């Protein structure tokens, strides 16, 4: 087949994406090696839907695991009636989901189990896929023109021909994997037919990070979780925490191989050593490096200019209230707390008014990265750890390294119960989610 493996597309016909996906466990090669892993679709990573705004997605789950799930259409400001946080769908059951695409959207999205207890270990086995909204911005030259690629950055750890179990230490830390993939295969080779290339770029690993930097070459940014920048900024490296996208130009400057690595990141994550006194935790440190694929530039690339502007944001109305939620940790017993509590899905935490915005201080007391993720309502990121954010743009997911305060100025958009939690899924799992009323 081609050079860089990408999940299959499905894209919507007259307006309509009517699919019906199965949940199921799947034999495959991955890697170079048979596993069973747990897939929508039947691959892994599950496919790209690829709609437009206005159109409507029917997508009817049929659940062939031998445990409940359920889907969490992440970063879709869809009513959470629809996607619905609280909903088990029973093993061999069906549920239909079915949603407009607001009108105002663009970007990477992606689909995956939220099914509380139970995330950590069906997304490490395989279950999840990528949505794309495309735009009339897509048409702009300086985008048409490039080479367009979606990079699903996802970690995996294989025993005995299946996902590896977790451990304690897992539940703690997040389960990272040995097997650093893109689209399910082992540092794949793209070999770029145009001097432009516009990546999507998707981290749904449970808990690894990914520091990205090209060899020899700066990346610009165009667009965040939901939307696109006000215009292309230019970074040297680009942190993608659990649940975070972005979308990058890449302008290849010279013929040759580029590596994409994954760069030493420390999180935070946690081992235990015994050197004489009692077992103590001890930092794990820095990731090793990653290499994520190799790139290799055409003959003699002549990029194309970068777009003078991409979307303007919008201004939002004066906020109503100000939030404070604080993040902490109890380690040795793997439980995660906000506000000193743990999840309840009978108890709301926090009620506002639709069509309102608020101030979301997030601080994060705990000595790991938290990844903070809030469904149905995309909010702007204003600053974190005291540094003015530099760009404006949707985004909904927020890392906060130890000790960092995130301002976010969040729009209350669909009426509804839904959910706010770290994105180590394993810590959503073990009690760091909150509940949101909208009314
Ligand atoms: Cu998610
Ligand atoms: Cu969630
Ligand atoms: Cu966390």
């Given at each position: 087949?081609?050079?860089?493996?990408?999940?299959?597309?499905?894209?919507?016909?007259?307006?309509?994406?009517?699919?019906?996906?199965?949940?199921?466990?799947?034999?495959?090669?991955?890697?170079?090696?048979?596993?069973?892993?747990?897939?929508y679709g039947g691959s892994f990573p599950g496919?790209?839907?690829?709609?437009?705004?206005?159109?409507?997605?029917?997508?009817?789950?049929?659940?062939?695991?031998?445990?409940?799930?359920?889907?969490?259409?992440?970063?879709?400001?869809?009513?959470?009636?629809?996607?619905?946080?609280?909903?088990?769908?029973?093993?061999?059951?069906?549920?239909?989901?079915?949603?407009?695409?607001?009108?105002?959207?663009?970007?990477?999205?992606?689909?995956?189990?939220?099914?509380?207890?139970?995330?950590?270990?069906?997304?490490?086995?395989?279950?999840?896929?990528?949505?794309?909204?495309?735009?009339?911005?897509?048409?702009?030259?300086?985008?048409?023109?490039?080479?367009?690629?979606?990079?699903?950055?996802?970690?995996?750890?294989?025993?005995?021909?299946?996902?590896?179990?977790?451990?304690?230490?897992?539940?703690?830390?997040?389960?990272?994997?040995?097997?650093?993939?893109?689209?399910?295969a082992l540092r794949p080779t793209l070999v770029?037919?145009?001097?432009?290339?516009?990546?999507?770029?998707?981290?749904?690993?449970?808990?690894?990070?990914?520091?990205?930097?090209?060899?020899?070459?700066?990346?610009?940014?165009?667009?965040?979780?939901?939307?696109?920048?006000?215009?292309?900024?230019?970074?040297?490296?680009?942190?993608?925490?659990?649940?975070?996208?972005?979308?990058?130009?890449?302008?290849?400057?010279?013929?040759?191989?580029?590596?994409?690595?994954?760069?030493?990141?420390?999180?935070?994550?946690?081992?235990?050593?015994?050197?004489?006194?009692?077992?103590?935790?001890?930092?794990?440190?820095?990731?090793?490096?990653?290499?994520?694929?190799?790139?290799?530039?055409?003959?003699?690339?002549?990029?194309?200019?970068?777009?003078?502007?991409?979307?303007?944001?919008?201004?939002?109305?004066?906020?109503?209230?100000?939030?404070?939620?604080?993040?902490?940790?109890?380690?040795?017993?793997?439980?995660?707390?906000?506000?000193?509590?743990?999840?309840?899905?009978?108890?709301?935490?926090?009620?506002?008014?639709?069509?309102?915005?608020?101030?979301?201080?997030?601080?994060?007391?705990?000595?790991?990265?938290?990844?903070?993720?809030?469904?149905?309502?995309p909010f702007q990121v204003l600053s974190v750890?005291?540094?003015?954010?530099?760009?404006?743009?949707?985004?909904?997911?927020?890392?906060?390294?130890?000790?960092?305060?995130?301002?976010?100025?969040?729009?209350?958009?669909?009426?509804?119960?839904?959910?706010?939690?770290?994105?180590?899924?394993?810590?959503?799992?073990?009690?760091?989610?909150?509940?949101?009323?909208?009314?």
């Amino acid at each position: 087949g081609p050079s860089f493996p990408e999940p299959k597309v499905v894209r919507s016909q007259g307006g309509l994406l009517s699919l019906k996906l199965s949940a199921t466990p799947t034999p495959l090669a991955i890697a170079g090696q048979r596993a069973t892993l747990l897939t929508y679709g039947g691959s892994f990573p599950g496919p790209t839907l690829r709609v437009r705004p206005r159109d409507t997605v029917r997508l009817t789950l049929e659940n062939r695991l031998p445990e409940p799930t359920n889907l969490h259409w992440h970063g879709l400001p869809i009513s959470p009636k629809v996607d619905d946080p609280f909903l088990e769908i029973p093993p061999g059951e069906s549920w239909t989901y079915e949603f407009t695409v607001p009108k105002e959207l663009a970007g990477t999205f992606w689909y995956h189990p939220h099914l509380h207890g139970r995330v950590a270990p069906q997304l490490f086995a395989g279950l999840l896929g990528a949505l794309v909204v495309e735009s009339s911005l897509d048409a702009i030259p300086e985008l048409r023109e490039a080479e367009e690629h979606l990079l699903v950055l996802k970690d995996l750890a294989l025993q005995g021909g299946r996902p590896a179990p977790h451990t304690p230490m897992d539940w703690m830390n997040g389960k990272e994997g040995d097997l650093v993939l893109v689209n399910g295969a082992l540092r794949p080779t793209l070999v770029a037919q145009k001097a432009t290339l516009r990546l999507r770029l998707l981290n749904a690993s449970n808990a690894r990070y990914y520091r990205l930097a090209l060899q020899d070459h700066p990346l610009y940014l165009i667009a965040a979780d939901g939307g696109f920048l006000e215009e292309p900024l230019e970074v040297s490296e680009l942190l993608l925490a659990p649940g975070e996208r972005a979308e990058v130009l890449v302008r290849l400057r010279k013929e040759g191989r580029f590596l994409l690595q994954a760069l030493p990141y420390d999180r935070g994550a946690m081992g235990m050593m015994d050197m004489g006194g009692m077992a103590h935790a001890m930092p794990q440190g820095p990731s090793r490096p990653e290499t994520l694929l190799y790139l290799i530039a055409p003959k003699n690339p002549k990029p194309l200019p970068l777009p003078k502007a991409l979307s303007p944001f919008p201004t939002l109305p004066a906020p109503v209230v100000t939030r404070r939620l604080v993040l902490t940790e109890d380690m040795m017993a793997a439980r995660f707390f906000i506000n000193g509590q743990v999840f309840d899905h009978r108890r709301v935490d926090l009620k506002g008014q639709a069509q309102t915005v608020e101030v979301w201080e997030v601080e994060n007391q705990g000595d790991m990265d938290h990844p903070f993720h809030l469904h149905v309502h995309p909010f702007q990121v204003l600053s974190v750890g005291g540094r003015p954010f530099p760009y404006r743009a949707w985004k909904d997911v927020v890392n906060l390294k130890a000790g960092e305060v995130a301002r976010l100025l969040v729009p209350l958009r669909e009426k509804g119960r839904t959910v706010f939690h770290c994105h180590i899924v394993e810590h959503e799992d073990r009690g760091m989610m909150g509940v949101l009323e909208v009314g």
